[PDB]
């Protein structure tokens, strides 16, 4: 009988729920379509407001609701079409329908999916624009990885999971060091840094870039000490020389082995040479140990790799899942 309650029901009537595309304790995904245009399809994520959490609404729900609306409008960010409350006091997100899956399953499908350097350049262009748009709006994603990169019907890749996102903190405002999946976590976060910036996301992009080239995770450490050791082995040992004050981080740790000098651009050519010199130039700038000398998302978009041949593949010609 409440005026807001009937307004929510009027909004729920705008979209007709269909097949259950996904099940889960946190959320359930259903196929849907507008009542005024049944050809306009939509995905309805039914967030179970009660998901074994004793502190009320879960942070991943609050963050998605806030930042997906804030970032709405960009072609490489999953569009939040509408939000309405369910009869059972559950939260529902009407989202862009992205039927072609994500980038992880393409990368994992080594037997059937074939893609080349021009396709990597097309995907990376989409991802870089997404992270650029996030930072342009002072938002950190803090969980970039292949399986969080969903693919639209036309081939455009969209950044999706914002459950760990946060607005740019002010100076002196401490942030959590426990963000970003381990394999994509930058060294400053592995060291417990509490005052970081966009560079933390650029590092994850560098790992997605590297993972695309070799079609396997670059540094798949099983523990934080393994992740630290792996970065030391494959990128270089962070030291006070290349990263002043690094040893002063709240959780700085070193395997206490013979330090490995930081590898230069040439060293990456052997393994990641598929994208060429200019491509490995970009990769190397995204994987700088000191986040201060790490390339930014805006700088990334003006790099020469994009305008160097071969030109990126058109999204309509990108590989589809089998």
């Amino acid at each position: 009988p409440d005026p807001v309650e009937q307004m929510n029901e009027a909004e729920k009537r705008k979209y007709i729920k269909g097949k259950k595309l996904g099940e889960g304790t946190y959320a359930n995904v259903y196929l849907g379509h507008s009542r005024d245009d049944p050809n306009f399809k939509v995905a309805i994520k039914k967030i179970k407001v009660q998901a074994q959490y004793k502190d009320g609404m879960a942070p991943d729900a609050v963050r998605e609701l806030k930042y997906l609306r804030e970032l709405r409008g960009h072609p490489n960010i999953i569009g939040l079409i509408s939000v309405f409350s369910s009869k059972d006091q559950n939260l529902n997100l009407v989202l862009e329908y992205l039927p072609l899956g994500d980038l992880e399953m393409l990368i994992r499908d080594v037997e059937r999916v074939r893609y080349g350097a021009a396709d990597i350049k097309a995907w990376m262009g989409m991802l870089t624009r997404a992270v650029w748009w996030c930072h342009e709006n002072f938002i950190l994603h803090r969980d970039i990885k292949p399986n969080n990169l969903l693919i639209a019907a036309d081939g455009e890749v969209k950044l999706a999971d914002f459950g760990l996102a946060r607005s740019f903190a002010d100076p002196g405002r401490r942030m959590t060091a426990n963000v970003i999946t381990r394999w994509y976590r930058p060294p400053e976060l592995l060291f417990g840094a509490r005052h970081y910036g966009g560079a933390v996301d650029i590092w994850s992009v560098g790992m997605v870039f590297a993972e695309l080239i070799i079609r396997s995770p670059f540094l798949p450490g099983n523990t934080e000490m393994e992740q630290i050791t792996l970065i030391c082995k494959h990128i270089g040992t962070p030291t006070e020389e290349n990263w002043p004050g690094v040893s002063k981080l709240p959780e700085w740790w070193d395997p206490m082995e013979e330090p490995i000098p930081v590898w230069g651009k040439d060293a990456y050519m052997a393994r990641f040479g598929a994208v060429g010199s200019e491509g490995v130039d970009l990769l190397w700038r995204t994987l700088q140990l000191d986040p201060k000398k790490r390339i930014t998302a805006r700088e990334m978009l003006e790099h020469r790799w994009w305008r160097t041949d071969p030109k990126p593949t058109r999204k309509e010609d990108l590989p589809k899942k089998s």
Partner: protein, 66 residues
């Protein structure tokens, strides 16, 4: 166009290198802020945008005109 036609270029203001506030000075020399990669340029850019964002947005006149 690398920014997909979405590049934000402010109209009434410009974020130049000379902008600074003494309250920032305390943190610029904080070991954790520098060695951790905190961007003070982003904060200054964030403040300047919000200081001018919607300066000529007349809520009353715009909403009554619809």
């Amino acid at each position: 166009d690398p920014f997909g036609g979405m590049e934000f270029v402010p109209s009434r203001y410009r974020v130049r290198e000379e902008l600074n506030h003494p309250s920032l000075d305390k943190y610029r020399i904080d070991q954790q802020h520098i060695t951790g990669g905190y961007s003070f340029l982003d904060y200054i850019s964030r403040a300047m945008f919000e200081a001018f964002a919607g300066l000529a947005v007349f809520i009353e006149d715009e909403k009554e005109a619809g």
